[PDB]
């Protein structure tokens, strides 16, 4: 379908390598979001504790 | 800033100087919540946990955008004697939120 | 030949519609692969650029004479691409191209021209 030259093979290898970098970068983004999620869930516990006692 | 457990607690909220209500049934509470989203009490509502845990059906009913009326479960005056669910409530929060079940 | 005569010795404004220039090129690929003459890209014989040249280059206007030859070859891209040797060497002789897009045609748009890959 796409034009079969050696240049197009290099463009496809380049975008495969960019998507394989993107999997790593977005997993790292998910890791930072999970880090602040577990930083906030215990604040939710402490907020519910203070809310019920007051 | 409506809060719905009883009208008896809600006149205590008037004794705090904010508007509150009481319905003792689900559809009545969502209907008064619906007109409260329609004309605002500045869009910050808590409903009794034994009345409605998740009133978000009203959010997808009227105002799907901006999530401005924030809806909160709240421990009632006949229920705050026990300290409702806190740790298993966070268990089901994690189970609802991230998919996984954790212990931590 | 008839178009250069009618243009440049009787002062007409000839427009030459050269239909389906890929059937021409597969005909000369047939004789050029009869004679074992070594090919360029994708089987077409190596002297094909000069034959597309000595077709397409017989157009223009000449000084002092009021004739003119306006050529429109209706090319047919085989795989619907520009890298193929027939639309490619066509684009390297002539001055311009107009590319019809199948994507605009599926939405029911006649003339299905898209302007961004065409030039003049
Ligand atoms: N059976 C054939 N009949 C006619 N031409 C042929 C045949 N086989 C090969 N040829 C062509 O003849 C050419 C041979 O070149 P050559 O004999 O050196 O003469 P010239 O210098 O005139 O091309 C090749 O280019 C080849 O394509």
From Swiss-Prot, chain A:
Domain of life, per lineage: Bacteria
What the record says about family reads: Belongs to the V-ATPase D subunit family.
- Which species is this UniProt entry from? Thermus thermophilus (strain ATCC 27634 / DSM 579 / HB8)
Q: What's its job? A: Produces ATP from ADP in the presence of a proton gradient across the membrane.
Covered range within the whole protein? 3 to 56 of 223
Protein name, UniProt field: V-type ATP synthase subunit D
UniProtKB/Swiss-Prot annotation, chain B:
Q: Does the keyword Glycosyltransferase apply?
A: no
Cited SUPFAM superfamilies? AtpF-like
Record keywords: ATP synthesis, Hydrogen ion transport, Ion transport, Transport
Q: Which GO terms describe its molecular function?
A: ATP binding; proton-transporting ATP synthase activity, rotational mechanism; proton-transporting ATPase activity, rotational mechanism
GO terms classed as biological process: proton motive force-driven plasma membrane ATP synthesis
Membrane-traversing stretches? none
| Designated name of the protein | V-type ATP synthase subunit F
From the broadest rank down, the organism's phylogenetic lineage runs: Bacteria, Thermotogati, Deinococcota, Deinococci, Thermales
Swiss-Prot record, chain C:
> What are the cysteine partners in each disulfide bond?
none
Top-rank taxon, per record: Bacteria
Q: Which family is it part of?
A: Belongs to the ATPase alpha/beta chains family.
Physiological role: Produces ATP from ADP in the presence of a proton gradient across the membrane. The V-type beta chain is a regulatory subunit.
This protein is called what? V-type ATP synthase beta chain
List the taxonomic lineage.
Bacteria, Thermotogati, Deinococcota, Deinococci, Thermales
Q: Which residues of the full protein are shown?
A: 240 to 359 of 478
